[PDB]
Amino acid sequence: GSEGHRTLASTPALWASIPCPRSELRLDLVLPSGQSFRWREQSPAHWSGVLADQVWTLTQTEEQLHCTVYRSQASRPTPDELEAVRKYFQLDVTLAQLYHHWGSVDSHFQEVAQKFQGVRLLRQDPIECLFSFICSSNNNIARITGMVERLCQAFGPRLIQLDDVTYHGFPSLQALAGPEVEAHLRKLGLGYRARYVSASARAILEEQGGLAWLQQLRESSYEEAHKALCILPGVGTQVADCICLMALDKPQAVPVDVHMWHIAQRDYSWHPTTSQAKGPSPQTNKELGNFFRSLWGPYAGWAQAVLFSADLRQ
DNA sequence: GCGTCCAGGTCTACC
DNA sequence: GGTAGACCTGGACGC
Ligand SMILES: [Ca+2]
Numbered sequence: 001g002s003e004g005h006r007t008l009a010s011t012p013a014l015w016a017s018i019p020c021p022r023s024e025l026r027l028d029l030v031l032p033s034g035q036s037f038r039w040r041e042q043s044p045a046h047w048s049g050v051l052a053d054q055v056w057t058l059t060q061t062e063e064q065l066h067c068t069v070y071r072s073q074a075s076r077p078t079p080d081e082l083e084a085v086r087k088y089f090q091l092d093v094t095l096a097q098l099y100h101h102w103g104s105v106d107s108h109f110q111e112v113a114q115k116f117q118g119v120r121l122l123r124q125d126p127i128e129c130l131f132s133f134i135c136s137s138n139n140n141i142a143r144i145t146g147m148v149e150r151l152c153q154a155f156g157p158r159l160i161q162l163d164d165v166t167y168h169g170f171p172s173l174q175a176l177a178g179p180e181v182e183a184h185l186r187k188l189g190l191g192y193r194a195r196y197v198s199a200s201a202r203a204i205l206e207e208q209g210g211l212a213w214l215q216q217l218r219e220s221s222y223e224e225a226h227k228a229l230c231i232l233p234g235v236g237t238q239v240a241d242c243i244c245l246m247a248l249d250k251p252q253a254v255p256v257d258v259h260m261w262h263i264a265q266r267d268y269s270w271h272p273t274t275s276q277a278k279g280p281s282p283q284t285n286k287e288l289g290n291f292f293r294s295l296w297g298p299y300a301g302w303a304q305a306v307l308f309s310a311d312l313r314q
Numbered sequence: 315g316c317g318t319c320c321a322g323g324t325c326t327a328c329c
Numbered sequence: 330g331g332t333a334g335a336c337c338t339g340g341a342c343g344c
Pocket of ligand 1: 138258320
């Protein structure tokens with residue numbers, strides 16, 4: 001009863017709600033879609049993970065988002081803590097207004113948007129976002145998820161345990177920059193990305209001026225930010241865009257991976273015009289990004305998140 | 315069963 | 330400057 005992952009029906013007095021209609025948010029379409037790799041549906045329709053340095057379980061009804069926190073006597077989430085959740089899901093942004101606009105200027109989006117409502121963008125921590133996506137290149141979401149979990153268990157702060165799952169906070173720069181981290185990560189199956197994680201932690205700490213350098217990027221311009229990130233090992237045009245869009249508040253950033261290329265080709269009959277090659281290249285990828293930006297506008301990256309999520313369901 | 319594919323790409327030797 | 334290839338892993342086919 002007081003053990004294991006909570007459920008809305010099993011410990012009612014431990015949940016607090018936040019007004020939020022399904023049309024504004026669909027947990028099942030956001031949490032496992034490759035934005036954040038730290039959420040698990042431990043129980044049907046209930047997603048658990050670390051949010052703002054503590055564990056949470058989230059589940060929704062038709063007009064409500066139910067939340068519960070595991071911190072020392074058990075109690076319902078406080079208003080201050082609930083605000084942590086609203087900020088994570090950027091709930092002040094009305095998804096209905098965005099869908100309307102995108103739908104109005106792109107009939108294909110309108111068709112897809114009718115079946116995939118509630119796909120919004122999470123506002124993530126720069127450090128977690130940087131290393132999680134460094135782990136995502138040339139990989140699949142299922143594998144990435146495992147790697148990130150083993151990376152946190154091995155180098156992140158131990159939080160609390162529910163059933164047989166021990167939650168860990170995301171590793172710090174100092175820890176990822178530690179001795180023999182690469183070798184450890186390789187044994188944890190991160191492949192060549194193990195070097196990228198170690199190498200990027202050190203560059204940030206020993207060459208770019210630590211954490212402050214990364215955090216300052218949120219006030220910098222998309223152009224500047226993306227430019228700054230490409231310096232880090234394991235970070236290319238796509239990873240940089242992922243971070244700008246999901247962790248640095250650059251809503252116009254559009255990541256271009258294999259999924260978005262296929263979408264461009266079959267759903268818009270798109271082809272490079274300024275670019276030389278007829279396939280993916282640093283030049284064509286950059287062009288595809290501008291194409292999407294001129295199609296959807298300022299929040300083009302968010303529209304991208306919708307089609308990407310929808311393309312995963314196939 | 316085994317070899318080839320691929321997945322939210324990067325990085326590098328080279329024409 | 331604008332490419333071809335190599336690359337850790339492991340669930341997916343194709344045969
Ligand atoms: Ca590929």
